[PDB]
Amino acid sequence: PYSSPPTNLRSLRDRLTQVAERQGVVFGRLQRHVAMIVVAQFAATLTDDTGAPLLLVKGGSSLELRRGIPDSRTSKDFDTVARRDIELIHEQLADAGETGWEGFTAIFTAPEEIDVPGMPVKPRRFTAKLSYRGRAFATVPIEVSSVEAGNADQFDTLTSDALGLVGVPAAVAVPCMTIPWQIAQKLHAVTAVLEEPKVNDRAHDLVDLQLLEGLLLDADLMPTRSACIAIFEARAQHPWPPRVATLPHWPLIYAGALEGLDHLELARTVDAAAQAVQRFVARIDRATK
């Protein structure tokens, strides 16, 4: 490895160019992952007065942390659930970003509301603009949802070594929403019926649900049913248990979501994916108390 951290932006990029070559990854994918991890480090500094996380990672960034880059779907958003109002979360992120971490700083743009049904308080989107030793590095889109039911009562912690590969030694340890709640959210999202202008485009959730099924401990099947019930009932949209339908443009959208996952036992067509996820729904639904 390297013996000191990168002296500046150009060095950081040069080392990333070298790591991407060795790892067989596209420079952009690796740069994106490092940028996400830096934002995740800022997120992990937000704690309540007992030291518990205020912000938990979910969605694609979580799956990338659980499984590693090669065995996870490529995603651009940093999605989170927050235990506090957006103004507070944003402010604390801004404070952390100005203080910096291992040479990285960040400023955060204005949170903008996302029109989502079934949530008394809707999610917000904004962007982190990262710099390394004062020079602009990358931007990361961020989404923050409010807590629903028990989805922030507990968390898993996932670690990345990616910053270590470029000579930045500080440990990366990121609090993440647990698998039962990720399954509940993704099952709800992929089976939702969207309003006339919008069309449900979320075939990638079928990939994520199969990956989550692979990671889920058999002993957490009851907690998964409990979470699914909680989310479906809280949102009060379509009822549990859902039917995993697919839309006319999903065959190719689904295929696109399989990019880079050739070494995994996944359904290779959207129809087989829908069948697998429906089988999972049935298995969850049987896990009663």
- Examine residue 241 and say whether the peptide bond preceding it is cis (omega within 30 degrees of 0): yes
Radius of gyration of the chain (CA): 19
Give CA angle at 8 (7, 9), nearest 5°: 145
Answer yes or no: is 95 a known binding residue.
no
Task: Report whether 183 belongs to an annotated binding site.
Answer: no
Residue 70 φ then ψ, to 5°: -65, -30
**CB 37, CB 172: distance < 8 Å:** yes
Residue 62 near residue 158, CB atoms below 8 Å = yes
**Residue 115 counted as an annotated binding residue:** no
**In whole angstroms, what is the distance from residue 59 CA to residue 40 CA?**
13
- Per the annotation, does 213 bind a ligand? yes
Tell me whether residue 59 is annotated as binding: no
Is residue 61 a known part of a binding site?
no
Closest CA to 163 of 173, 153, 154: 173
Helical packing angle, 204-215 and 250-257, nearest 10°? 50
Q: Is 161 annotated as a binding residue?
A: yes
Which residues lie across from 126 on neighbouring strands? 142
- Distance from chain centroid for Cα 99: 25
Cβ partners under 8 Å of residue 201, min gap 6 = 247, 249, 253
Measured distance CA(189)–CA(64) in Å, rounded = 19
**Residue 285, annotated as binding a ligand:** no
Residue 119 is assigned to a ligand binding site:
no
Does 263 carry a binding-site annotation?
no
What technique was this entry resolved by?
X-ray
Tell me: is residue 36 an annotated ligand-binding position: no
What token pair was written down for 46?
């937000």
Resolution at which this structure was determined, Å: 1.6
Residue 253 CA to its chain's centroid (Å): 19
